[PDB]
Amino acid sequence: EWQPAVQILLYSLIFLLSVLGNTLVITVLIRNKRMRTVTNIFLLSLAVSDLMLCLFCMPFNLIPNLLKDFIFGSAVCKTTTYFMGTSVSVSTLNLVAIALERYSAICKPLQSRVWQTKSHALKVIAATWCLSFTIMTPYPIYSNLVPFTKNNNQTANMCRFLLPNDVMQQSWHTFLLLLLFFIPGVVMAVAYGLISLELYQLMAKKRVIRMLIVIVVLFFLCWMPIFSANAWRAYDTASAERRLSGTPISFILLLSYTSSCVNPIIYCFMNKRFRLGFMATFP
Amino acid sequence: DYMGWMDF
Amino acid sequence: SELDQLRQEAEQLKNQIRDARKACADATLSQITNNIDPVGRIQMRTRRTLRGHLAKIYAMHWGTDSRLLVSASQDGKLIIWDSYTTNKVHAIPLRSSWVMTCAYAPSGNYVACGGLDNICSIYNLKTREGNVRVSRELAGHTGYLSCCRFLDDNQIVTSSGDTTCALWDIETGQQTTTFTGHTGDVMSLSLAPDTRLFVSGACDASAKLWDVREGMCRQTFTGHESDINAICFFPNGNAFATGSDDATCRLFDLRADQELMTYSHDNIICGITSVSFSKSGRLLLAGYDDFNCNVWDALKADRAGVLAGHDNRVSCLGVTDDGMAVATGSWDSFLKIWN
Amino acid sequence: AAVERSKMIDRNLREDGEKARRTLRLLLLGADNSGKSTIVKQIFETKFQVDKVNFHMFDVGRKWIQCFNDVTAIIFVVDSSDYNRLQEALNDFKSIWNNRWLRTISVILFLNKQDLLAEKVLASKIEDYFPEFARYTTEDPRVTRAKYFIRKEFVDISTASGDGRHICYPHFTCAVDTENARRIFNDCKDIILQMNLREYNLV
Amino acid sequence: TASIAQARKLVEQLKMEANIDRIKVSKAAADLMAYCEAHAKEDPLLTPVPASENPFR
Numbered sequence: 001e002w003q004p005a006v007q008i009l010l011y012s013l014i015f016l017l018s019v020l021g022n023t024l025v026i027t028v029l030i031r032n033k034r035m036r037t038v039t040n041i042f043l044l045s046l047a048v049s050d051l052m053l054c055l056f057c058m059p060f061n062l063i064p065n066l067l068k069d070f071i072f073g074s075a076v077c078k079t080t081t082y083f084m085g086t087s088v089s090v091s092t093l094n095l096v097a098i099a100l101e102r103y104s105a106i107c108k109p110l111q112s113r114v115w116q117t118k119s120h121a122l123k124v125i126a127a128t129w130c131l132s133f134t135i136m137t138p139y140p141i142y143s144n145l146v147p148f149t150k151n152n153n154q155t156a157n158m159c160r161f162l163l164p165n166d167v168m169q170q171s172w173h174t175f176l177l178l179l180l181f182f183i184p185g186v187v188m189a190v191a192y193g194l195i196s197l198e199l200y201q202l203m204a205k206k207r208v209i210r211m212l213i214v215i216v217v218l219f220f221l222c223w224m225p226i227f228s229a230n231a232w233r234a235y236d237t238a239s240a241e242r243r244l245s246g247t248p249i250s251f252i253l254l255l256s257y258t259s260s261c262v263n264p265i266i267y268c269f270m271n272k273r274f275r276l277g278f279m280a281t282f283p
Numbered sequence: 284d285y286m287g288w289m290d291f
Numbered sequence: 292s293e294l295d296q297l298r299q300e301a302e303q304l305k306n307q308i309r310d311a312r313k314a315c316a317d318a319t320l321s322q323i324t325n326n327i328d329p330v331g332r333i334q335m336r337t338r339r340t341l342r343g344h345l346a347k348i349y350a351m352h353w354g355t356d357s358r359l360l361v362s363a364s365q366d367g368k369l370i371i372w373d374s375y376t377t378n379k380v381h382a383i384p385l386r387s388s389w390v391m392t393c394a395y396a397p398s399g400n401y402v403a404c405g406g407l408d409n410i411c412s413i414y415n416l417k418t419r420e421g422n423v424r425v426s427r428e429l430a431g432h433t434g435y436l437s438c439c440r441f442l443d444d445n446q447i448v449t450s451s452g453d454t455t456c457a458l459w460d461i462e463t464g465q466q467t468t469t470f471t472g473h474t475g476d477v478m479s480l481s482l483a484p485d486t487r488l489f490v491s492g493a494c495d496a497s498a499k500l501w502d503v504r505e506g507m508c509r510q511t512f513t514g515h516e517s518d519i520n521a522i523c524f525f526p527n528g529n530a531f532a533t534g535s536d537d538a539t540c541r542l543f544d545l546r547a548d549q550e551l552m553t554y555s556h557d558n559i560i561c562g563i564t565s566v567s568f569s570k571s572g573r574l575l576l577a578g579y580d581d582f583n584c585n586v587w588d589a590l591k592a593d594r595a596g597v598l599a600g601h602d603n604r605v606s607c608l609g610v611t612d613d614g615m616a617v618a619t620g621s622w623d624s625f626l627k628i629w630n
Numbered sequence: 631a632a633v634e635r636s637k638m639i640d641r642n643l644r645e646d647g648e649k650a651r652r653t654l655r656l657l658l659l660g661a662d663n664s665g666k667s668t669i670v671k672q673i674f675e676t677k678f679q680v681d682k683v684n685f686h687m688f689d690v691g692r693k694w695i696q697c698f699n700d701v702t703a704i705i706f707v708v709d710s711s712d713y714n715r716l717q718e719a720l721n722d723f724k725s726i727w728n729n730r731w732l733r734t735i736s737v738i739l740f741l742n743k744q745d746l747l748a749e750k751v752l753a754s755k756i757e758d759y760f761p762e763f764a765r766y767t768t769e770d771p772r773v774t775r776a777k778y779f780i781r782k783e784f785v786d787i788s789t790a791s792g793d794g795r796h797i798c799y800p801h802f803t804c805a806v807d808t809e810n811a812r813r814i815f816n817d818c819k820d821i822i823l824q825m826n827l828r829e830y831n832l833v
Numbered sequence: 834t835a836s837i838a839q840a841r842k843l844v845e846q847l848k849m850e851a852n853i854d855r856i857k858v859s860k861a862a863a864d865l866m867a868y869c870e871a872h873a874k875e876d877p878l879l880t881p882v883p884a885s886e887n888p889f890r
Contacts, residue, residue, distance in 0.1 A: 345643070347700070389673050
């Protein structure tokens with residue numbers, strides 16, 4: 001029972017912290033009108049998408065993995081699977097949105113004055129949410145309880161997802177891991193690379209540059225594992241499941257969700273301009 | 284038995 | 292020796308002025324108003340926000356009907372607002388963006404505007420072609436216009452950085468009188484309710500009372516430690532108030548020729564930008580550099596309320612002729628209407 | 631019908647708030663003897679363009695300075711050639727630098743007619759006006775001692791207070807120099823970069 | 834002569850500003866107090882009018 005006891009402690013802690021962090025960022029950024037800058041529009045959007053990711057991924061992956069059957073109805077398997085992919089998708093384009101905005105402001109300061117506005121930020125927010133809700137539509141369609149029976153002769157289920165053939169399954173998993181992880185991570189490596197280079201070309205500058213390196217590291221550590229696993233299963237579902245099913249994939253998933261825990265820390269709480277906003281937001 | 288995993 | 296003799300005669304006369312005032316100083320306003328009742332807490336709230344300006348609002352003036360107002364911004368727009376609906380009735384492109392003052396004619400036919408251009412421009416609202424147009428440009432000051440106020444569709448009074456005031460005939464475009472006697476830049480102006488007199492306040496901390504017909508300084512008032520930014524007649528025309536970088540307001544009565552009251556609190560530490568009175572002249576409303584506006588009980592001198600709701604300097608302030616609303620403008624580019 | 635007019639007005643006032651945003655606004659300060667009108671290479675006002683970025687200078691022919699509290703940079707011009715008024719410029723520069731309304735505007739400082747300073751020092755009485763120039767110790771070495779001493783005095787005023795909110799960008803200029811537009815452009819690039827770092831939550 | 838010429842005016846002006854007739858400040862104060870009481874009920878800022886009568890809602 002030790003591995004289950006650790007697994008519930010880890011998930012419940014990371015859940016409570018990701019709820020608290022994102023809801024505080026949402027709170028302090030809505031109350032303080034002063035803190036309403038192009039960047040803080042993306043941080044508010046990001047914190048909402050991370051709050052959805054926390055609420056709809058974490059408990060609904062934990063509880064079935066503890067019970068060893070999917071306890072909720074087909075409507076819950078459909079609805080959760082939609083919001084999981086939706087929240088994961090919006091976040092990865094809000095993190096590539098913050099890196100390309102920061103790069104325009106820091107490496108081309110005059111030219112960006114033409115377009116970098118609060119209205120332009122809200123165009124990119126609206127386009128990102130709408131295109132995420134759009135492309136994730138297969139999830140509530142082809143995600144339906146699949147039945148089996150336990151050794152106690154109880155009927156049991158496992159929520160799963162299946163395009164109509166294996167070529168569609170493989171091409172789909174290749175598309176999501178090359179447009180919701182790979183390129184989103186090579187454009188955050190070249191954006192924060194160029195910002196670090198031009199910024200370094202001194203103690204404050206080195207304090208900035210180590211944060212830019214930590215951001216591109218934490219992105220690849222959270223997401224590479226889960227996006228590579230899904231691709232493994234879509235090719236040899238049998239070998240992938242024989243290796244990773246049960247306890248191992250639950251930690252690859254926890255590592256993925258830990259992104260929605262760290263984002264409030266590295267983007268908000270590490271800057272007192274917001275930390276004071278916090279001190280100004282509450283009595 | 285319970286095998287595989289949801290995508291996210 | 293004549294220069295010294297005058298100088299001693301001026302010192303003796305100035306000493307006489309002080310003695311005549313001191314002899315007149317029989318009781319303070321706060322000794323007379325000791326028994327009255329306080330304006331209680333003036334709880335007040337924003338009823339409207341006007342969102343069209345894209346830079347610092349510098350000035351605003353109500354029309355004679357308490358619906359229309361004009362406002363000036365350093366984006367180079369003069370905007371006329373229907374405050375009831377918030378509709379923009381008109382937007383006028385100014386020829387220079389560095390404006391510091393705006394006025395509405397009592398007829399509603401015209402608005403006036405000026406600043407670092409050293410000109411007062413008159414705009415005709417009621418043309419047959421349906422577009423607002425320049426009626427005349429009044430040129431003759433050698434320093435920036437700080438304030439302006441029409442007496443009628445043919446006459447307007449102006450204050451300037453060149454230490455003067457001037458009265459203009461708008462039809463001829465010429466000064467009918469120049470008023471001279473301030474030594475610092477004149478920052479503000481206020482016409483008496485009968486339009487026979489006006490007061491102006493300056494950077495040398497003087498306020499002066501002028502005869503509009505005869506072109507003379509009747510009286511000079513002093514008390515502030517620093518430049519006067521704002522001045523306003525009390526509704527009866529027998530008194531006025533000033534505000535300054537001193538972080539205080541003063542009240543004077545013309546007939547006693549001296550200060551009756553000073554409004555201050557040791558937590559208030561920044562300059563006053565603007566002042567105006569309610570319809571009874573029982574409340575003095577003042578704008579501040581600390582982004583607030585404060586409501587003072589002009590007779591008990593207590594701080595009665597706060598209009599907190601701007602993200603920068605309250606740059607200008609005005610009560611309507613009905614007494615039903617206060618407008619405040621600001622360096623964040625919005626006006627707000629209150630109560 | 632009145633509201634259709636208000637929205638058609640609010641659309642043209644937004645189309646004008648953009649044409650405004652495309653330009654950088656600069657204020658000129660300095661006494662006569664400074665050559666302000668010769669730092670210019672293209673309320674009085676004038677316009678110029680560098681690398682497709684558009685600039686608008688303004689000079690007024692303690693109160694009127696408040697209007698300029700949101701310009702990108704003050705261009706402050708000093709005559710370097712005689713020291714009778716050097717302290718006057720230093721008191722004036724102190725008055726600009728510590729102004730309540732200018733606490734976040736960086737100053738581009740032009741130490742102008744530096745060739746006449748070089749001629750005066752190569753021929754100057756400078757230590758009679760500034761006794762602490764005796765044994766100063768950092769072109770001709772003596773001219774460099776004067777230039778760096780002259781510069782040192784303004785930049786030490788500029789660093790005695792400021793808290794990193796705004797900075798001073800000193801330059802030496804001859805009346806024949808064309809490069810002042812490039813210098814203003816680079817320093818505006820740097821001023822905009824410094825605030826973009828704090829607004830983009832990097833510091 | 835400009836300083837002496839100007840100073841004669843600065844003297845004349847003080848002669849005018851002294852020739853004026855001043856009243857006791859207790860009378861001046863009592864008039865502002867009497868005015869505000871006579872115009873108290875007619876001032877919607879010191880006591881707000883009901884939302885039916887208020888033109889700004």
